[PDB]
Amino acid sequence: IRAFEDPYPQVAQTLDLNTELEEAAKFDFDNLKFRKAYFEEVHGPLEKEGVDFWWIDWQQGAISKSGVDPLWLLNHYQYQNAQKKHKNNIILSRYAGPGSHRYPLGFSGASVISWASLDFQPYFTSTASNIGYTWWSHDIGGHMQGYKDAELSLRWLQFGVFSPINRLHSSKSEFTSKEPWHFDAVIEQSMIDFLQLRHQLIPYLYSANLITASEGRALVEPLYYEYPMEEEAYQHRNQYLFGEQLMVAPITEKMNSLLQMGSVEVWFPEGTWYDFFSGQPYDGKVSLKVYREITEMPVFAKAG
C-alpha cells in the first residue's frame, strides 16, 4: 500500500508509517499488523462496496523472512478471512504446496494459447487429484500469446465445461476475447450450447462437490483410480472420470481437414457404454479411435 492509494492514510496511521517521506506499507504477510490492515483497511472498504471474494494473483516469488512462501500465507489467511462475510466462501489463487487444497479454488494462470497447452490440460487436471488438489480453474481458451484458431477456443471450452471450474479469461490483447459472438455463427452457437450445458450440470457438480468435502473423492479422477490393474488406464493421459456417472475423452488436436472431424483414442472399460449426447453405443473392453465434428465432444455413460 503505497502513498498514492485511497486506503494509505488509514494504513499509515495503523502501521505508524512516515507519511511526509511517503513510507510504503510493503507487503509482509509474516506480519500480524500488516495482515490485519490488509484485511480490515484495504480489502474491508472494497468488501463494504460489495466485493464477494478475492482473486489473489501472486507472481512475485517465494521469498519471506519466515521462510514461508508468501503465496501459502496469502491463500491460508485470505481463505480464513473470506469466511467472515460469506458461508463457504472461496479465493482464486495459485497452488501453494501439499495441503493447500484447504484453500480453493486453484488458479493455474497465464497459459500460452495453443493446441499444445490444451493437449496438456486434461492430464494436468486429473493428475492433480494425486496430491488432493481437485479444484483447478484454468483460463478457458488459454491466457496469452500463442495463436488464433476458433476451433482451439471451442475445443478448450468443451474441456472447461467438463473441468472442475469453467472460468473464461484472456490477455490484454484486443484480439483474445472469449465472448462466443467473437467467432462465426457455427462456433458461436456451439459455444453457447456448451455454456448452457455447464449450468445444466450444476446439480451434478454441486453433489460431487459435497462428496469431495465429506468423503474425500475427487470430481475428476484419472482412469487408474477406478481401473488400477488395467494397463490401458495408464495409457490415456487426457481421459478421466467426471463424477461417478460420466467418462470424458476431450479432443485436444486440430481436426483432420479431409474428415472435417477431430479424434481421440478412447479406452472403453468392460461394459456397454453410450455417447452421452448421441447414444452411439460401444462394447468394452476395447481401445478405439473416435471421431467428432468440432461442435461435438466424446463423453460417455455406462448402461444404468
Ligand X SMILES: OC[C@H]1O[C@H](O[C@@H]2[C@@H](O)[C@@H](O[C@@H]3[C@@H](O)[C@@H](O[C@@H]4[C@@H](O)[C@@H](O)O[C@H](CO)[C@H]4O)O[C@H](CO)[C@H]3O)O[C@H](CO)[C@H]2O)[C@H](O)[C@@H](O)[C@@H]1O
Instruction: Out of 7, 104, 106, 146, point to the residue binding a copy of itself (CB under 8 A).
Output: 146
Stretch that binds a copy of itself, among 33-41, 53-61, 120-128, 133-141 (CB under 8 A): 53-61
121: Cα separation from own chain's centroid: 10
Contact call for residues 57 and 71 (beta carbons, < 8 A):
no
| CB of residue 32 to ligand X, shortest distance in Å | 28
Amino acid of residue 43:
H
What is the Cα–Cα distance from 240 to 101, expressed in whole angstroms?
20
What are the beta bridge partners of residue 112?
144
Class of residue 6 by CB neighbours under 10 A (exposed 0-12, middle 13-18, buried 19+): exposed
Instruction: Out of 109, 204, 224, 295, point to the residue binding ligand X (CB under 6 A).
Output: 109
Neighbours of 16 (CB within 10 A): 8
- Taken in order 47, 51, 53, 55, is the CA torsion positive or negative? negative
Sequence-distant (6+) residues with CB within 8 A of 175 are 148
Q: Is 173 in the site for a copy of itself (CB under 8 A)?
A: yes
User: What part of residues 250-279 is at the interface with a copy of itself (CB under 8 A)?
Assistant: 265
Neighbours of 172 (CB within 10 A): 6
Q: Is 289 in the site for ligand X (CB under 6 A)?
A: no
- Nearest CB to ligand X, comparing residues 173 and 278: 173
Q: Is 145 in the site for a copy of itself (CB under 8 A)?
A: yes
Q: Is 285 in the site for a copy of itself (CB under 8 A)?
A: yes
Stretch that binds a copy of itself, among 59-67, 155-163, 194-202, 270-278 (CB under 8 A): 59-67
- Nearest CB to a copy of itself, comparing residues 208 and 251: 251
Cell of 243: 463424477
Stretch that binds a copy of itself, among 76-84, 119-127, 145-153, 244-252 (CB under 8 A): 145-153
Q: In sequence order, what DSSP letters do the residues of 104-128 get, joined into one string?
A: PPEE----B-SHHHHHHHHHHHHHG
Q: In sequence order, what DSSP letters do the residues of 90-106 get, joined into one string?
A: -EEB---STTGGGSPPE
Q: Is 144 in the site for a copy of itself (CB under 8 A)?
A: yes
Q: Which does 148 bind (CB under 5 to 8 A by kind): a copy of itself, ligand X, none?
A: a copy of itself
- Nearest CB to a copy of itself, comparing residues 14 and 171: 171
Q: Which of 278, 207, 212 is nearest to 245 (CA)?
A: 207
Q: Which of 253, 294, 290 is nearest to 122 (CA)?
A: 253
| CB of residue 143 to ligand X, shortest distance in Å | 6
The pattern of x and - marking residues 183 through 222 that bind a copy of itself according to CB under 8 A reads -xxx--x---------------------------------
Q: Report the interface residues with a copy of itself, using CB under 8 A.
A: 18, 21, 23-24, 26, 59-61, 63-65, 113, 144-149, 171, 173-176, 182, 184-186, 189, 265, 283, 285-289
Q: Report the interface residues with ligand X, using CB under 6 A.
A: 57, 59, 109-110, 143-144, 171-172
